[PDB]
RNA sequence: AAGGUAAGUAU
RNA sequence: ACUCUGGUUUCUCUUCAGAUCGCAUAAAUCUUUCGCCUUUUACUAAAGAUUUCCGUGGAGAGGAACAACUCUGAGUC
């Protein structure tokens, strides 16, 4: 029920992302009252217990912190930016915008695999990393 | 062919990729019934003048049944008046054709 | 369209061809601009325009 | 109440704000942008007020921007149905006659000018006197007596209270 | 329209 | 033949829509099916329900312009 930590102030999120060491800071931009964003928050809550050792999730509200809306072009719901090691990582998953996941993951295990791949890429030092599962298609059929 | 056409008609009754323009596969006017396929054009007894059809061509394309019947039924005075009217019309047509390609 | 009227007004081609070119452009926008990709529905308009021109 | 203004100041404004690539019309800022929100609407008017073949020229008024950013044609195209049908029937006959007479017809070029043609100045070449000649028929004076007095006009019979309301 | 930005490194 | 009768052009403003608002006709979103299908922009094509959008009428109000010329019915005429 959206009990994850939330950035009341915009600058607080900035220093929270800055205060990172050997961990990935998943800043989930959006609004809790949105239904798709509610599903994304529920998925993040489910993941949080399993991967709290290196993956920290820290939500934020666009209305509360609108200064970062124009910084990374935050104009969609469910947006996720893996701002890790003080470096905005390039997560490529077969999408045009390979630096933003703006829709709730269908399954928790997929998100866990994605976040651990992001951690591996960040620790290796590369600023870009690909996804084992391409999302160019939704596998609707 | 017409008998077989009626046969399969009764059988049927009872038993992205962008396109530049329309296709002819959607035509529905194909009816084997000769009465429906060949419909008598409504000439209104010499009074039917379709909009886009050329007036001179329509007069030529007219079946002239009404015209012939009117000529037969016209009296001697009526025939004289019709002859004078058509003579004046021919003179006017000559006047217009003189201007064209002069 | 505006430039066609401009070149008509500034002499050039006569008014009969002006009307003919207006007719063509109105009934060939699909070819001229290819709205197909810009909008799929517009194809309907252009295709029917061809139909009306077909009759015209 | 408000009234009209001479076109000279509109021409001066558009000439001054000919291009926004310089520092001239940069101060407009939001004011300029505001008008842009309704840019397509004016286009509608320019596709509704565009002249018919009989309309050799028309002097429809406009609503322009104080900065000259946009111009709005404040005219709803009004023509009585029978007179419009009669005019277009005359044009139908005349076009058929012209096609019959003309041995080779010519279609103009898809680009009316060069692809980099600058916006033509109204005072420079649009003000040219030569208007060519609109497609006008020669009807019989005896039969067309109630016709040729006002026929082939943008708004025929205007200010004739015996026939129409007027404005 | 697109689903086709390698990242890294100091200037 | 006698007395009162009293404008129409207009400009806007505020309402209500009966009336094919419009003797013309678009678009957007949502919803169910159809071709679906490769993700959204999208579609195909119909139905259903909204919305915007071009427009319009009724009615009322306020100024300008013909407001003095009355139109016209009533006034046993």
UniProtKB/Swiss-Prot annotation, chain A:
Subcellular location: Nucleus
Disulfide bond annotation, renumbered to this chain: 37-78
Involvement in disease: Burn-McKeown syndrome: A disease characterized by choanal atresia, sensorineural deafness, cardiac defects, and typical craniofacial dysmorphism consisting of narrow palpebral fissures, coloboma of the lower eyelids, prominent nose with high nasal bridge, short philtrum, cleft lip and/or palate, and large and protruding ears. Intellectual development is normal.
Record note on quaternary structure: Component of the precatalytic spliceosome (spliceosome B complex). Component of the U5 snRNP complex. Component of the U4/U6-U5 tri-snRNP complex. The U4/U6-U5 tri-snRNP complex is a building block of the precatalytic spliceosome (spliceosome B complex). The U4/U6-U5 tri-snRNP complex is composed of the U4, U6 and U5 snRNAs and at least PRPF3, PRPF4, PRPF6, PRPF8, PRPF31, SNRNP200, TXNL4A, SNRNP40, SNRPB, SNRPD1, SNRPD2, SNRPD3, SNRPE, SNRPF, SNRPG, DDX23, CD2BP2, PPIH, SNU13, EFTUD2, SART1 and USP39, plus LSM2, LSM3, LSM4, LSM5, LSM6, LSM7 and LSM8. Directly interacts with CD2BP2.
Protein function: Plays a role in pre-mRNA splicing as component of the U5 snRNP and U4/U6-U5 tri-snRNP complexes that are involved in spliceosome assembly, and as component of the precatalytic spliceosome (spliceosome B complex).
SUPFAM superfamilies documented for this protein: Thioredoxin-like (SSF52833)
Similarity remark: Belongs to the DIM1 family.
Domain of life: Eukaryota
One GO cellular component, as annotated: cytosol
Modified residues (Phosphoserine): 131
Curated annotation (Swiss-Prot), chain B:
Protein localization: Nucleus; Chromosome
PTM notes: In vitro phosphorylated by CLK1 and U1 snRNP-associated protein kinase. Phosphorylated by SRPK2 and this phosphorylation is required for its association with the tri-snRNP (U4/U6-U5 tri-small nuclear ribonucleoproteins) and subsequent spliceosomal B complex formation. May be phosphorylated by SRPK2 on Ser residues in the SR domain; the phosphorylation is required for the removal of inappropriate R-loops during transcription.
Family from the record: Belongs to the DEAD box helicase family. DDX23/PRP28 subfamily.
Subunit comment: The phosphorylated form (by SRPK2) is a component of the U4/U6-U5 tri-snRNP complex composed of the U4, U6 and U5 snRNAs and at least PRPF3, PRPF4, PRPF6, PRPF8, PRPF31, SNRNP200, TXNL4A, WDR57, SNRNP40, DDX23, CD2BP2, PPIH, SNU13, EFTUD2, SART1 and USP39. Identified in the spliceosome C complex. Interacts with ERBB4. Interacts with ERCC6.
Entry function: Involved in pre-mRNA splicing and its phosphorylated form (by SRPK2) is required for spliceosomal B complex formation. Independently of its spliceosome formation function, required for the suppression of incorrect R-loops formed during transcription; R-loops are composed of a DNA:RNA hybrid and the associated non-template single-stranded DNA.
Protein name: Probable ATP-dependent RNA helicase DDX23
Organism, scientific name: Homo sapiens
From Swiss-Prot, chain C:
Disease link: Retinitis pigmentosa 13: A retinal dystrophy belonging to the group of pigmentary retinopathies. Retinitis pigmentosa is characterized by retinal pigment deposits visible on fundus examination and primary loss of rod photoreceptor cells followed by secondary loss of cone photoreceptors. Patients typically have night vision blindness and loss of midperipheral visual field. As their condition progresses, they lose their far peripheral visual field and eventually central vision as well.
Tissue and organ expression note: Widely expressed.
Function, in words: Plays a role in pre-mRNA splicing as core component of precatalytic, catalytic and postcatalytic spliceosomal complexes, both of the predominant U2-type spliceosome and the minor U12-type spliceosome. Functions as a scaffold that mediates the ordered assembly of spliceosomal proteins and snRNAs. Required for the assembly of the U4/U6-U5 tri-snRNP complex, a building block of the spliceosome. Functions as a scaffold that positions spliceosomal U2, U5 and U6 snRNAs at splice sites on pre-mRNA substrates, so that splicing can occur. Interacts with both the 5' and the 3' splice site.
Top-level taxon of origin: Eukaryota
Designated name of the protein: Pre-mRNA-processing-splicing factor 8
Stretch of the intact protein here: 557 to 612 of 2335
Subcellular location: Nucleus; Nucleus speckle
UniProtKB/Swiss-Prot annotation, chain D:
Location relative to the cell: Nucleus; Nucleus speckle
Tissue: Widely expressed.
Domain notes: The MPN (JAB/Mov34) domain mediates interaction with TSSC4 and SNRNP200. Has structural similarity with deubiquitinating enzymes, but lacks the residues that would bind the catalytic metal ion.
Functional description taken from the UniProt entry: Plays a role in pre-mRNA splicing as core component of precatalytic, catalytic and postcatalytic spliceosomal complexes, both of the predominant U2-type spliceosome and the minor U12-type spliceosome. Functions as a scaffold that mediates the ordered assembly of spliceosomal proteins and snRNAs. Required for the assembly of the U4/U6-U5 tri-snRNP complex, a building block of the spliceosome. Functions as a scaffold that positions spliceosomal U2, U5 and U6 snRNAs at splice sites on pre-mRNA substrates, so that splicing can occur. Interacts with both the 5' and the 3' splice site.
Protein name: Pre-mRNA-processing-splicing factor 8
